Write an enzyme that holds these catalytic residues in place. Structure first.
Site, mmCIF file in Angstrom:
data_model
loop_
_atom_site.group_PDB
_atom_site.id
_atom_site.type_symbol
_atom_site.label_atom_id
_atom_site.label_comp_id
_atom_site.label_asym_id
_atom_site.label_seq_id
_atom_site.Cartn_x
_atom_site.Cartn_y
_atom_site.Cartn_z
ATOM 1 N N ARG A 1 43.521 -51.441 1.882
ATOM 2 C CA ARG A 1 44.968 -51.440 1.603
ATOM 3 C C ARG A 1 45.594 -52.730 2.105
ATOM 4 O O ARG A 1 44.962 -53.531 2.806
ATOM 5 C CB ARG A 1 45.639 -50.235 2.292
ATOM 6 C CG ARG A 1 45.575 -50.341 3.843
ATOM 7 C CD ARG A 1 46.384 -49.237 4.535
ATOM 8 N NE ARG A 1 46.376 -49.467 5.989
ATOM 9 C CZ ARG A 1 47.037 -48.755 6.874
ATOM 10 N NH1 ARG A 1 47.710 -47.656 6.490
ATOM 11 N NH2 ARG A 1 46.991 -49.134 8.161
ATOM 12 N N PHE B 1 42.661 -46.898 6.378
ATOM 13 C CA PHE B 1 43.294 -45.790 7.057
ATOM 14 C C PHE B 1 42.745 -44.466 6.532
ATOM 15 O O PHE B 1 43.185 -43.967 5.491
ATOM 16 C CB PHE B 1 44.842 -45.842 6.997
ATOM 17 C CG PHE B 1 45.503 -44.873 7.946
ATOM 18 C CD1 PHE B 1 45.312 -44.986 9.326
ATOM 19 C CD2 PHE B 1 46.277 -43.823 7.463
ATOM 20 C CE1 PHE B 1 45.907 -44.076 10.213
ATOM 21 C CE2 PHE B 1 46.858 -42.899 8.335
ATOM 22 C CZ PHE B 1 46.672 -43.020 9.717
ATOM 23 N N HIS C 1 55.254 -50.648 3.997
ATOM 24 C CA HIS C 1 54.385 -50.160 2.923
ATOM 25 C C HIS C 1 54.440 -50.897 1.600
ATOM 26 O O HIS C 1 55.511 -51.230 1.132
ATOM 27 C CB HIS C 1 54.636 -48.676 2.708
ATOM 28 C CG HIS C 1 54.573 -47.882 3.980
ATOM 29 N ND1 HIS C 1 53.420 -47.774 4.726
ATOM 30 C CD2 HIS C 1 55.524 -47.166 4.640
ATOM 31 C CE1 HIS C 1 53.653 -46.998 5.778
ATOM 32 N NE2 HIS C 1 54.915 -46.598 5.736
ATOM 33 N N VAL D 1 46.939 -49.390 12.465
ATOM 34 C CA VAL D 1 47.807 -50.309 13.199
ATOM 35 C C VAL D 1 47.560 -50.080 14.692
ATOM 36 O O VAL D 1 47.523 -51.036 15.469
ATOM 37 C CB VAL D 1 49.313 -50.059 12.837
ATOM 38 C CG1 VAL D 1 50.233 -50.900 13.732
ATOM 39 C CG2 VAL D 1 49.517 -50.423 11.344
ATOM 40 N N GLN D 2 47.407 -48.816 15.083
ATOM 41 C CA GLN D 2 47.202 -48.453 16.490
ATOM 42 C C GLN D 2 46.016 -49.230 17.095
ATOM 43 O O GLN D 2 46.096 -49.804 18.207
ATOM 44 C CB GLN D 2 46.965 -46.950 16.601
ATOM 45 C CG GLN D 2 48.234 -46.056 16.462
ATOM 46 C CD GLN D 2 48.537 -45.658 14.998
ATOM 47 O OE1 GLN D 2 48.144 -46.349 14.038
ATOM 48 N NE2 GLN D 2 49.230 -44.535 14.834
ATOM 49 N N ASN E 1 55.158 -50.478 9.943
ATOM 50 C CA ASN E 1 54.120 -50.535 8.932
ATOM 51 C C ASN E 1 54.902 -50.640 7.616
ATOM 52 O O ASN E 1 55.510 -49.667 7.213
ATOM 53 C CB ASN E 1 53.260 -49.268 8.995
ATOM 54 C CG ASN E 1 52.029 -49.338 8.057
ATOM 55 O OD1 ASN E 1 51.808 -50.335 7.371
ATOM 56 N ND2 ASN E 1 51.271 -48.257 7.997
ATOM 57 N N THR F 1 85.038 -62.755 31.762
ATOM 58 C CA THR F 1 83.916 -63.059 30.857
ATOM 59 C C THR F 1 84.043 -64.495 30.301
ATOM 60 O O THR F 1 83.048 -65.179 30.155
ATOM 61 C CB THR F 1 83.748 -62.023 29.712
ATOM 62 O OG1 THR F 1 84.846 -62.125 28.799
ATOM 63 C CG2 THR F 1 83.654 -60.566 30.274
ATOM 64 N N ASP F 2 85.271 -64.989 30.141
ATOM 65 C CA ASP F 2 85.452 -66.390 29.742
ATOM 66 C C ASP F 2 84.853 -67.357 30.791
ATOM 67 O O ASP F 2 84.301 -68.397 30.445
ATOM 68 C CB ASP F 2 86.940 -66.680 29.581
ATOM 69 C CG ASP F 2 87.197 -68.030 28.944
ATOM 70 O OD1 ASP F 2 87.112 -68.122 27.709
ATOM 71 O OD2 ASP F 2 87.564 -68.974 29.682
ATOM 72 N N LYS G 1 79.375 -61.522 29.001
ATOM 73 C CA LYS G 1 79.653 -62.218 27.725
ATOM 74 C C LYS G 1 78.393 -62.179 26.866
ATOM 75 O O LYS G 1 77.281 -62.449 27.351
ATOM 76 C CB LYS G 1 80.051 -63.686 27.995
ATOM 77 C CG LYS G 1 80.767 -64.358 26.827
ATOM 78 C CD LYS G 1 82.144 -63.696 26.590
ATOM 79 C CE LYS G 1 83.291 -64.668 26.470
ATOM 80 N NZ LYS G 1 84.633 -63.959 26.504
HETATM 81 C C1 LIG Z 1 89.851 -62.005 28.198
HETATM 82 N N1 LIG Z 1 88.847 -61.452 29.235
HETATM 83 C C2 LIG Z 1 87.886 -62.103 30.000
HETATM 84 O O1 LIG Z 1 87.677 -63.285 29.999
HETATM 85 N N2 LIG Z 1 87.215 -61.149 30.779
HETATM 86 C C3 LIG Z 1 87.707 -59.924 30.551
HETATM 87 C C4 LIG Z 1 87.337 -58.633 31.119
HETATM 88 O O2 LIG Z 1 86.439 -58.439 31.925
HETATM 89 N N3 LIG Z 1 88.138 -57.620 30.643
HETATM 90 C C5 LIG Z 1 89.154 -57.722 29.726
HETATM 91 O O3 LIG Z 1 89.792 -56.742 29.411
HETATM 92 N N4 LIG Z 1 89.435 -58.976 29.174
HETATM 93 C C6 LIG Z 1 88.719 -59.997 29.627
HETATM 94 C C1 LIG Z 2 49.742 -45.119 6.033
HETATM 95 N N1 LIG Z 2 49.913 -44.463 7.421
HETATM 96 C C2 LIG Z 2 50.488 -43.250 7.785
HETATM 97 O O1 LIG Z 2 50.958 -42.447 7.026
HETATM 98 N N2 LIG Z 2 50.413 -43.121 9.179
HETATM 99 C C3 LIG Z 2 49.815 -44.190 9.720
HETATM 100 C C4 LIG Z 2 49.513 -44.504 11.111
HETATM 101 O O2 LIG Z 2 49.803 -43.815 12.078
HETATM 102 N N3 LIG Z 2 48.835 -45.697 11.228
HETATM 103 C C5 LIG Z 2 48.480 -46.556 10.217
HETATM 104 O O3 LIG Z 2 47.865 -47.568 10.466
HETATM 105 N N4 LIG Z 2 48.838 -46.231 8.905
HETATM 106 C C6 LIG Z 2 49.459 -45.071 8.729
#
Ligand SMILES: Cn1c(=O)[nH]c2c(=O)[nH]c(=O)[nH]c21
Ligand SMILES: Cn1c(=O)[nH]c2c(=O)[nH]c(=O)[nH]c21
Ligand SMILES: Cn1c(=O)[nH]c2c(=O)[nH]c(=O)[nH]c21
Ligand SMILES: Cn1c(=O)[nH]c2c(=O)[nH]c(=O)[nH]c21
Lengths: 295, 295, 295, 295
Positions: free
Chosen positions: A176, A159, A256, A227-228, A254, A57-58, A10
């Site tokens: 920048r 950069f 821009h 950034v690296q 990043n 799942t219910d 779920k």
């Molecule tokens: C309504 N419903 C559940 O609650 N579990 C599941 C499930 O595993 N599979 C279903 O097709 N329906 C469903």
């Molecule tokens: C402006 N910019 C790029 O074009 N490449 C990268 C990158 O790899 N790393 C940055 O910090 N800036 C930057």
């Protein structure tokens, strides 16, 4: 043909929990979005229409609410580990649970210079996330992250000295704007099970706080060569501050901001040292990634 | 057939401007998104393919950058008024200019408990906006607003005593969560022209600050009888604090958080006084509006 | 202070309805998103915390489902009119209802060159909408529209002869790409009430089909002198084809595709007659509007 | 600390290309969004501020436009392979290129029941994508996909016989709505290099067409026992039709449409066999995945 891999569950389960201190009357809220996917001996639901192996799942949704009702939901690393462990222990044929949690910000309001007991504000769309993989017999792997942290510095970013060939038009620069949305992930050493995760509970919030602080201070203070270079300095520091982290990954766009030449209009000077008005570019954007580990 | 109304111009023009204090070395950034639409004697461009009456939308874009280079961009009420006045004075056949500006947040970072000179963070997606209509011979009409301010209170909100009929299933409540995204607009008295707008410059930032403060304090402190009642209290206060405002309009969604009955599972108690885990609802949502003016 | 205007209700109510022909076994689905806002003698809910005058927004939601269960949901002009009329007739103190409906596309799938009885595909995000205002004693005002219709033509669009002054850099052109997202609205003559709306039911789908067809054919066939000129031709035709329409409004963004000069690289020719690769611009964009009525 | 992995490049590069047949006068447009990330001996840009190893992301952007100008941009599998091969051959220290391309739909308009030479419509937001990884000495790995294909069937979907325990509330059903957004990916056998990719060019468009056709027909015709069962049938067929595919992966959300009990209102019957009006749920949603390969 055969099933090579299968997972189901779920997604987008929104959960809110409130904690009320009967003493102080202070209330604290937590809101998250949860996804749980399971793996196990479920191939026959795909190949033979055998629904007997399917935990609906219910039902997974119900389980998330029940688990939040009976356990603390913070830190999310612990809540995710409890939730994932539940599935593999409960169901014999389920061997792995993958839990992803996004925590949304609800920050206590200050009214008249003081914390309000039950009112909150969403201050930015920044998230704190966790990915927890609980695999039977292989422990618990946790990756924690922060994302959606948007920052800009108006100077102290350079950069120059990059490769120049017949495909190059970019001019070198010594001043920048640098702006990005930070996505940072720290991967924890593998944990043997819930008991071990519980033993380190205090480190989770502390490490998130450290990662955030190191990111912000380094971005603000580094006279950035790229950034690296700046991102590598952030990851180095986080690894030095927390031994239980194995790797730190950063993924930074990043975003821009271009100079606008206005000289065609009455000789107006708006480039280089005279640049005051810029055009933020929505696309394209640089995308720079790196994973740093221990030597 | 005839042209009953026509307007055209440039939308989504992103602009960034930096101010550098050579003294302190402190830098301040402003980022906005601008839309300018013009009206005038331009019908023939639609009816006779006569482009001679068209100030190209690309030229309107150039004009926005040129105006930002030569004038302050804050407060946005002044910048919008200068930009709109430019078009009606410059072009004899253009009789109205409609300028919409959205200001994005770039909040100075605090590093080590102190303001950084040139590093900023986007703290929330809340916006400060202005709509300025400059109409030849009719002055300048300004509507200022804040939007995207998302808040939640976990208690001290009630909703009972509403109409009950055969279409009603909603239960009355004396304790619920209240959460909304605030959109508040204050409309200024008409200004005769730029000179008059310049004379009130200090009131713009002050009134925005007051509107924000009154919204937050009232939401946090009101033991709310309904969204309707709480919003009226906010608008009343703003009107009392600034005489040059004619009307205040609020538009508030009621973002529902539903209780989850878990009693089917081992008699777990999670409703009424025992409610701890809730399900935020993405849709539908209540939508409540009101415009308050002076009696 | 006083309440000058007030409206409230439920937004984002998603509704799906299926019709099953027991004869042919053919099924037809309808999916929409509905918003209903009410006005009336409700000021006291804002000023005196008097909830007795409030028809809860949850009850409005129930009413939408009940009305869809008991009435046809197509054409949306009729469904909106029935829904709005319900509120003003049911509640003595409610004097106006404002209903907005967005219809989503679920187009029957063709499998093996033939219509499938119960499988559908969402073919584009284009919407058919209606805005219905039902005001006690003043009848029913309906504005119908189509939106999100995205088109592009790669030639047969020109833009020259526009005003040139010291703010102008744009070059005149006799061959460019034209691309836009069409938003077209046709406003019907006021209807006295539901009976009159029912009498014109067949005209609704027919007029929507005509508006769409005229938009597409005119865009494709016009050797466009400008967006202004082309849009006026569309509106003229729609008004000529349907007498019960009073005005037609178009709002068209001009989504720019820029030439890329590659001459710096080995003298590569990619401009003017040699232009093959272009850069779509996400922002800014021209925005051109016009409302055409009868002379 | 050490660099364990690093990649960088340009994302969100929008490209449009037009092909003009001088003979027929027919024009055909292609629009895509491209991302290129490089890997190689670039660690020193992170660790020593050595920009000499960096091919600027702006130069990568230039290269994408130049490559599109000199080569066909369709099928995207070929264009991606040419673009990725360029980087590893051109730069001695770059050893891998990762190219992701999203193709947007521009479908030729039919005006008066016939194809227009230069006018197009975006019919749905469905995309055709490719991911190409070109790794020095290891050939070319291509994953092709279609995504954003949204479908719904109003009957002929069942879900019963699933696991029932103390966490289960879901009722079994023999007739429900099934709706999903299809994401399907087919991974090609590794290619030794560009020459081999060129030799299979005709299979790319054919296989995309087959994947789409099999998905739509199977969804429409299968009396579905579960999402799991239906998706496995789709993947089986695709693998049987194209030998050069190694695996097929599907990721399908289960977008729920809930019955609405209206019995509280005048005994209205709207559940089970009488269900006509449903409430589409925006969240949560089931998420079901599977990767099928050859036995
Ligand atoms: C309504 N419903 C559940 O609650 N579990 C599941 C499930 O595993 N599979 C279903 O097709 N329906 C469903
Ligand atoms: C402006 N910019 C790029 O074009 N490449 C990268 C990158 O790899 N790393 C940055 O910090 N800036 C930057
Ligand atoms: C929960 N709820 C409704 O259903 N209607 C309304 C309303 O008009 N006002 C509220 O404050 N809440 C509310
Ligand atoms: C390219 N372009 C502008 O700059 N302005 C305008 C305008 O008003 N109308 C157009 O059709 N194009 C255009």
């Amino acid at each position: 043909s055969a099933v090579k891999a299968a997972r189901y569950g779920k997604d987008n389960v929104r959960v809110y929990k409130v904690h009320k201190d009967e003493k102080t009357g202070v209330q604290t809220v937590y809101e998250m979005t949860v996804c749980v996917l399971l793996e196990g001996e479920i191939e026959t639901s795909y190949t033979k229409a055998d629904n007997s192996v399917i935990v609906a799942t219910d039902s997974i949704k119900n389980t998330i609410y029940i688990t939040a009702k009976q356990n603390p939901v913070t830190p999310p690393e612990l809540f995710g580990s409890i939730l994932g462990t539940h599935f593999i222990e409960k169901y014999n044929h389920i061997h792995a649970a993958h839990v992803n949690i996004v925590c949304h910000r609800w920050t206590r309001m200050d009214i008249d210079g003081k914390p309000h007991p039950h009112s909150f504000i969403r201050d930015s769309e920044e998230k704190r996330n966790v990915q927890v993989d609980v695999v039977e017999g292989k422990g618990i792997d946790i990756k924690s992250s922060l994302s959606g942290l948007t920052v800009l510095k108006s100077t102290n970013s350079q950069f120059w000295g990059f490769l120049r060939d017949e495909y190059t038009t970019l001019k070198e620069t010594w001043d920048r704007i640098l702006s990005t949305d930070v996505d940072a992930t720290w991967q924890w050493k593998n944990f043997s099970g819930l008991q071990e995760v519980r033993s380190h509970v205090p480190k989770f919030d502390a490490t998130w706080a450290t990662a955030r602080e190191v990111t912000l201070k380094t971005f603000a203070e580094d006279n950035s060569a790229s950034v690296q270079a700046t991102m590598y300095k952030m990851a180095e520091q986080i690894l030095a501050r927390q031994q239980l982290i194995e790797t730190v990954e950063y993924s930074l766009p990043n975003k821009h901001y271009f100079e606008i030449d206005l000289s065609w209009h009455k000789g107006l000077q708006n480039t280089g040292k005279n640049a005051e008005v810029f055009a933020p570019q929505s696309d394209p954007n640089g995308l720079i990634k790196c994973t740093v580990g221990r030597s």
